[PDB]
């Protein structure tokens, strides 16, 4: 009875998707002016990570970025002058995520030690010290995103997105619904919703206030490794192991467009939009990133300058440059 | 004012002094990943290393090893195993006694061997609880060919060095399981990565030397491949 009722509920959901699929984004946007061949050159290369860079996060000022490497270092770089503002020795060498607070006062990181450690940069003492440890997750911390100086949203490998109160260090809200390791987040501009791709080819739109899954999107054929909202916050794009990126629209609730190429048989590690959202920047496992025209699904260009797998990708909040970490321990900035 | 520029430059000189100081320590220390199961006996081998994740230190001949056992995670390991692609070697520990679970360890070995990211890492494969394997063969109740029909057409390899007072039946069994692992190792592993099979029990006072010894062969061959020798 349960199996039949659940399956028959999916029928009208699929029917309403086909009903509202009046046309295709390709058909509507087939007459727009193409973005044309885009050539971004490496502007600065940041050196001094010993091991592979796994994560990276820009600051809100578009100047400082924080990078994590698999050797217990959280180096905060100055992208203008290429200087190490701070180097934080992490307790566990294995760190899979890092976030820089919107205020820039604190910096977070976590990995296979199951703890989203918060480090206080504004300590009056010589160097930085660990602010608080966030225990309560039972799986590798895939991603950690700040909401404000006291609220942090985390993801783990135990199908658990959690929202924490860093003052008390207690998991206030837990988000449950994923059937797979949750690999990434993306907060909406207003920080009221956040999407979350997991290892079950299903991105779920969560509600921060309620803790309930507002919507669930499928269309991918493998683990989703990256996800990012469109800068307005009414859509998002995802990157999976099936060597394609799919753009989903919250209000329409279908797969608007897919970014796949015949010669590409490598998964996507990271995606990110430009400030205008016209370019999608997907970081492939074939050691370079490709710049997809988000409205035409055309390869505008390629950022080929990494020796190893591209692990992370960021665009500054003013959009003036694109950082790109990789497993070759080198953090390059593009423009 | 130019004062802030010099202080920013001054910190970078002090920061990059610390990174160089800790770079020597990081490169001089070998990282290992320990893998197995509930009944494998990873817990017993880490006890022999007396010289959410579990960090084991042992010093052999003034060389530091970090042995990383991962405890916290779920049974799905296809995304956190990508962290350990830069390790020296994967210490894969197998329970050779339980033949029911022994096919699952072969599939786990195959996924590691053929992994797009682990395809350049050597595996120091340990076949633990060989004492419990011997008493299983001698009893005769548990039959290998029930699980592995190919064992009916197997003979002890010519490269066999049985221990004194070892029954022929044990050596025929204990080498069929080893040889079964090496079918996957020799199918696709071509100089990129190497398997180092071994036979350990719970009462051995070694497996730290063997890791030290097998790591030295891994590092020796790594150097020789750069010189286009191997």
């Amino acid at each position, epitope marked *: 009875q349960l199996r039949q009722e659940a399956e028959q509920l999916k029928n009208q959901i699929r029917d309403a998707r086909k009903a509202c699929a009046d046309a295709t984004l390709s058909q509507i946007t087939n007459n727009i002016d193409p973005v044309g061949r885009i050539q971004m050159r490496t502007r600065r290369t940041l050196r001094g990570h010993l091991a592979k860079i796994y994560a990276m996060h820009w600051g809100t000022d578009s100047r400082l970025l924080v990078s994590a490497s698999q050797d217990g270092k959280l180096i905060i770089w100055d992208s203008y002058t290429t200087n190490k503002v701070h180097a934080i020795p992490l307790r566990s060498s294995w760190v899979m995520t890092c976030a820089y607070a919107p205020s820039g006062n604190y910096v977070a990181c976590g990995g296979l030690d199951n703890i989203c450690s918060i480090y206080n940069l504004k300590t009056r003492e010589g160097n930085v010290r660990v602010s608080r440890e966030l225990a309560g997750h039972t799986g590798y911390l895939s991603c950690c995103r700040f909401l404000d100086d006291n609220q942090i949203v985390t993801s783990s490998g135990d199908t658990t997105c959690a929202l924490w109160d860093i003052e008390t260090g207690q998991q206030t809200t837990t988000f449950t619904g994923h059937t797979g390791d949750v690999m990434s987040l993306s907060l909406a501009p207003d920080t009221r919703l956040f999407v979350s791709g997991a290892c079950d080819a299903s991105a779920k739109l969560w509600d921060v206030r309620e803790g309930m899954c507002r919507q669930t999107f499928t269309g991918h054929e493998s683990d989703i490794n990256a996800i990012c909202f469109f800068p307005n916050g009414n859509a998002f794009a995802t990157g999976s192991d099936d060597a394609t990126c799919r753009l989903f629209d919250l209000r329409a609730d279908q797969e608007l467009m897919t970014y796949s190429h015949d010669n590409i048989i490598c998964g996507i590690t990271s995606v990110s939009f430009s400030k205008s959202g016209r370019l999608l920047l997907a970081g492939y496992d074939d050691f370079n990133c490709n710049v997809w025209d988000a409205l035409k699904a055309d390869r505008a260009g390629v950022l080929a300058g990494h020796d190893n797998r591209v692990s992370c990708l960021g665009v500054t909040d003013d959009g003036m440059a694109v950082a790109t970490g990789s497993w070759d321990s080198f953090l390059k900035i593009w423009n | 004012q130019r004062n802030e520029e010099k202080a920013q430059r001054e910190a970078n000189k002090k920061i990059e002094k610390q990174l160089q100081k800790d770079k020597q320590v990081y490169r001089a220390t070998h990282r290992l990943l320990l893998l197995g199961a509930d009944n494998s006996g990873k817990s017993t081998i880490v006890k022999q290393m007396r010289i959410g994740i579990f960090e084991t230190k042992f010093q052999v001949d003034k060389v530091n090893f970090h042995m990383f056992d991962v405890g916290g995670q779920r049974d799905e390991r296809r995304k956190w195993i990508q962290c350990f692609n830069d390790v020296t070697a994967i210490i894969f520990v197998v329970d050779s006694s339980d033949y029911n679970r022994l096919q699952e360890a072969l599939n786990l070995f195959k996924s590691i061997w053929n992994n797009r990211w682990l395809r350049t890492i050597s595996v120091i494969l340990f076949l633990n609880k060989q004492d419990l394997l011997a008493e299983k063969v001698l009893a005769g109740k548990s039959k290998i060919e029930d699980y592995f*029909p190919e064992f009916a057409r197997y003979t002890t390899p010519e490269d066999a060095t049985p221990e004194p007072g070892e029954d022929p039946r044990v050596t025929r069994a204990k080498y069929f399981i080893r040889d079964e692992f090496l079918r996957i190792s020799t199918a696709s592993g071509d100089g990129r990565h190497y398997c180092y099979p071994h036979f350990t029990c719970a009462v051995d006072t070694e497996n730290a030397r063997r890791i030290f010894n097998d790591c030295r062969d891994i590092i020796q061959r790594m150097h020789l491949r750069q010189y286009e020798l191997l």
Partner: nanobody
Amino acid sequence: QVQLQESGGGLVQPGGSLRLSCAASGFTFSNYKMNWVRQAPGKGLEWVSDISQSGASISYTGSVKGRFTISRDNAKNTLYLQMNSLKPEDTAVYYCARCPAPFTRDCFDVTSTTYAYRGQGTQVTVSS
């Protein structure tokens, strides 16, 4: 959506023949190394057999080697497990498990407790 709906299964006397069919949907069938896994009553998941992308390389658990035949039909996007001889040991639920990544010979996590790309499963029980 990725969907795997197995068919076949039921009571067959020992020595019987049974044809399990796995109709894949919502992905390119031709890429993934399809597997077969089964769960004995009061027992953990175990792997039965697999098949490569084009059907080249085929392996079996050994407990069913020579008794079970596996083939994939890329025309209709279907997987098969032709059973020849059944033992009372074979009583289990067969799940049609798919390989996570599309173009790789490795297959991590197919026998996992909560794997995503596995089918619902069909009870295959043997008795007279």
